[PDB]
Structure formats: structure tokens, C-alpha cells
C-alpha atoms as one frame of an Amber mdcrd trajectory, in Angstrom:
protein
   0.000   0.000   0.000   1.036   3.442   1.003   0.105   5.879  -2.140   1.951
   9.249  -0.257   2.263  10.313   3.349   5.697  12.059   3.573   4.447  15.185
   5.859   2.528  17.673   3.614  -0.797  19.682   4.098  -0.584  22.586   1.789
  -3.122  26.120   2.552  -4.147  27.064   5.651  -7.556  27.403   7.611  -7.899
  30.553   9.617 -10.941  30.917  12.357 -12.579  33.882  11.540 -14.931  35.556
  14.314 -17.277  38.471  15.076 -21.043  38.719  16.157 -23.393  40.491  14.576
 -25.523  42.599  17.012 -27.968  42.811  13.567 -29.098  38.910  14.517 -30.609
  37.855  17.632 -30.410  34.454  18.840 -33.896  32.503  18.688 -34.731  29.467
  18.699 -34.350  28.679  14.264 -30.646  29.545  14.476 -30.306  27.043  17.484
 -31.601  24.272  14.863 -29.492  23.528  11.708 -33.172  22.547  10.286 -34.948
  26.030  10.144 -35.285  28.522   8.180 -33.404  31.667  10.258 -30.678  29.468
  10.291 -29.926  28.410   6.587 -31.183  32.221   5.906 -28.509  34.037   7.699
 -26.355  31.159   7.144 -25.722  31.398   3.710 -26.420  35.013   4.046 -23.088
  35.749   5.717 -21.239  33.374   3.715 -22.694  35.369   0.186 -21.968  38.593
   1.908 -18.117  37.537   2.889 -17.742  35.927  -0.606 -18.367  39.176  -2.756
 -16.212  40.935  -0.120 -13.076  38.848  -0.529 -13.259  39.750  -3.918 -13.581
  43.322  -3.309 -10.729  43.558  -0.465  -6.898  43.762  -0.710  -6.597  39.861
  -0.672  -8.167  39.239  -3.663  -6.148  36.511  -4.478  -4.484  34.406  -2.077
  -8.030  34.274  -0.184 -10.177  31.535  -2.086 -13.060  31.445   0.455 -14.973
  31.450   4.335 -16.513  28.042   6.005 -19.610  28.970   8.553 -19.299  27.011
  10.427 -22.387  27.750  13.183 -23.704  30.620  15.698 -23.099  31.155  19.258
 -24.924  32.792  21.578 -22.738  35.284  23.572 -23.270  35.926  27.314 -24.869
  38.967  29.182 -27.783  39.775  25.785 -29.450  37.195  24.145 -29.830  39.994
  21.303 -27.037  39.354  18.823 -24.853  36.145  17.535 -21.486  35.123  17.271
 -20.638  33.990  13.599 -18.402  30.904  13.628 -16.969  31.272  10.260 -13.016
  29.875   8.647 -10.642  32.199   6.459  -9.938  29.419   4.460  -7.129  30.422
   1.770  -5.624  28.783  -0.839  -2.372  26.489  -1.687  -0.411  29.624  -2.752
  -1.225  31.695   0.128   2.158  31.645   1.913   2.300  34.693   3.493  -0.397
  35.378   5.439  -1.420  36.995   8.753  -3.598  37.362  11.206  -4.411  40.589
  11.469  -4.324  41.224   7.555  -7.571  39.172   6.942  -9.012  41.127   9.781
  -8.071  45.090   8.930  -9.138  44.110   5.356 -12.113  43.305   6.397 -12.504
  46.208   8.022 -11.905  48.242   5.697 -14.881  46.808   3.577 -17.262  47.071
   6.875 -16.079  50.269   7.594 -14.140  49.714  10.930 -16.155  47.011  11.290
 -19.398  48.032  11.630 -21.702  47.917   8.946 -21.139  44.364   6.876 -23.320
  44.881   3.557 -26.257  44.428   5.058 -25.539  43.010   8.687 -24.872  45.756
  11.451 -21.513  44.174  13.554 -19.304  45.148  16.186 -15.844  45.746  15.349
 -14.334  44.420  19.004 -16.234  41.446  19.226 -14.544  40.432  15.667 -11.271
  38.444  16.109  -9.277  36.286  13.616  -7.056  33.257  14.855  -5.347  30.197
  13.268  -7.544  26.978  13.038  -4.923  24.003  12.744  -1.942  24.991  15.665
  -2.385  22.064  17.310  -4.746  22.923  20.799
């Protein structure tokens, strides 16, 4: 047998984060099978897509993974997005903080995402695969 294995991975997966006080937490985005959920699911996800595009990475950045929603502490009025600055085989040098000013700079200081009122502290990029 053995058809490869020789310590290789290739791109990177980086955990992108930031609620969105324009989506409060009910029940439908609790369950995968409703209609809230799927909505602003693939809401986000078209919203991010047309921004990487649009921002300074437009090229090393293929796509984002949404993952899920959580429900942040103290209000039960907004929504943590769980989404993944995935990037592609190519993208070599990449940091944190880049994926997050430029997406800053496309919500305006984090603020206003297309059509989704957010926070700008709340958002937070990290790296995915670090071993933890």
C-alpha cells in the first residue's frame, strides 16, 4: 500500500470571528433545520464571498466556512458567527491581522457588513490548525 504520506498539508484554515448585534439568537438559528438558520447562514457566507473579492486579498483568499452561531453571554440579542478564512495552496504569506483590517476596511471599521450591522471588538481572527 502506502500511495503518499511524507508530511505535507498545503493552505491554511484561519478561524474567523465576530457577532453580529444585527441577529438575535432565537430558537431557528439554534436548529441547523430552520429557516433563520440556513437564511442568515448562507447570508453571511454570500456577503463575505463578494467581499473577498472586493478587499486587498483578492487573491491568495479563495473562500470562508460557517461554520455555526453562538450565543454570547450577558444579551441574548445578537450572535457570534463561527466562520473559517480558508485560503488557498499559494497563500504563503499570510497573517492574522491582515484578513481582519481588510475586512474592516470593507465594513467600515467594522461596523456595517453589507447588510448586517456588527461590532468591530467582538470580531477576532485566529489560526484553526496549531495544534490545541
Amino acid at each position: 500500500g502506502s500511495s503518499g504520506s511524507s508530511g505535507s498539508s498545503s493552505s491554511q484554515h484561519f478561524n474567523l470571528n465576530f457577532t453580529i448585534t444585527n441577529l438575535p439568537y432565537s430558537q431557528d438559528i439554534a436548529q441547523p433545520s430552520t429557516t433563520k438558520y440556513q437564511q442568515t447562514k448562507r447570508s453571511i457566507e454570500n456577503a463575505l464571498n463578494q467581499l473577498f473579492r472586493n478587499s486587498s486579498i483578492k487573491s491568495y483568499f479563495s473562500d470562508c466556512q460557517v461554520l455555526a452561531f453562538r450565543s454570547v453571554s450577558n444579551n441574548n440579542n445578537h450572535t457570534g458567527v463561527d466562520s473559517l478564512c480558508n485560503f488557498s495552496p499559494l497563500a504563503r504569506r499570510v497573517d492574522r491581522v491582515a484578513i481582519y483590517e481588510e475586512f474592516l476596511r470593507m465594513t467600515h471599521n467594522g461596523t456595517q457588513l453589507l447588510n448586517f450591522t456588527l461590532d468591530r471588538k467582538s470580531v477576532f481572527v485566529d489560526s484553526g490548525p496549531s495544534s490545541g
